């Protein structure tokens, strides 16, 4: 695991322990961005605010998929670009959810959808560089989002935050490959 990959799953568990003690409403309020200004502090806060909502329906298969994505990303890009991708997509989702009037729409699916969008841009740019590893990541992310569309009551309500995260992912991809 890259240093950023371990921090990710560990921070989820650290926050999950806070929720067990203090309740999710209090913990979400603790980690919510202080404003909508696009600065490093608020982007990092949006990332932690997203993590508050991660343990709910967080399977070992979902964890392994995240690990596989992190490994692939780190093989192709500097580590700092992964942090920026996660923070920028979490912030975009949060800002849009807040505008819609429900910050609880900052759901894990927003991050999975952003990772899928990033991979789809990579596939478009490097059509002669596809590998079984990439093809499997794309397939598994599509299947995860297909299962959420079928079984998560909030999928439709989260359309706008998901779209904002996907657009942020596309913008980061264009930055990382120019
Ligand atoms: Na699942």
Author numbering: 2 to 179
How is this structure described in the published paper?
Here we use a robust deep learning pipeline to design complex folds and soluble analogues of integral membrane proteins. Unique membrane topologies, such as those from G-protein-coupled receptors, are not found in the soluble proteome, and we demonstrate that their structural features can be recapitulated in solution. Biophysical analyses demonstrate the high thermal stability of the designs, and experimental structures show remarkable design accuracy. The soluble analogues were functionalized with native structural motifs, as a proof of concept for bringing membrane protein functions to the soluble proteome, potentially enabling new approaches in drug discovery.
Next, we attempted to design a larger fold and a more intricate topology, the rhomboid protease fold (RPF). In addition, it harbours a serine–histidine catalytic dyad buried in the cell membrane, allowing it to cleave transmembrane protein domains and play an important part in cell signalling, which makes it a therapeutically interesting target. We selected 15 designs for protein expression, of which 13 were found to be soluble and five were selected for further experimental characterization. Three of the five designs showed a single monomeric species in solution and the expected helical secondary structure as assessed by circular dichroism. All of the three monomeric species of RPFs exhibited high thermal stability, with Tm above 90 °C. Notably, the AF2 structure predictions for the designs were less accurate than those for the CLF designs, with the r.m.s.d.Cα values between models and predictions ranging from 3.34 to 5.57 Å. In the case of the rhomboid protease design RPF_9, we observed high accuracy between the X-ray structure and the design model, with r.m.s.d.Cα of 0.97 Å and r.m.s.d.fa of 1.83 Å. However, the structural similarity was significantly lower compared with the target fold, as indicated by an r.m.s.d.Cα of 5.67 Å. Specifically, large structural deviations in the first extracellular loop were observed, which could have been due to its native positioning in the water–membrane interface. The designed RPF_9 fold showed significantly increased hydrophobicity on the transmembrane surface compared with the native RPF fold.
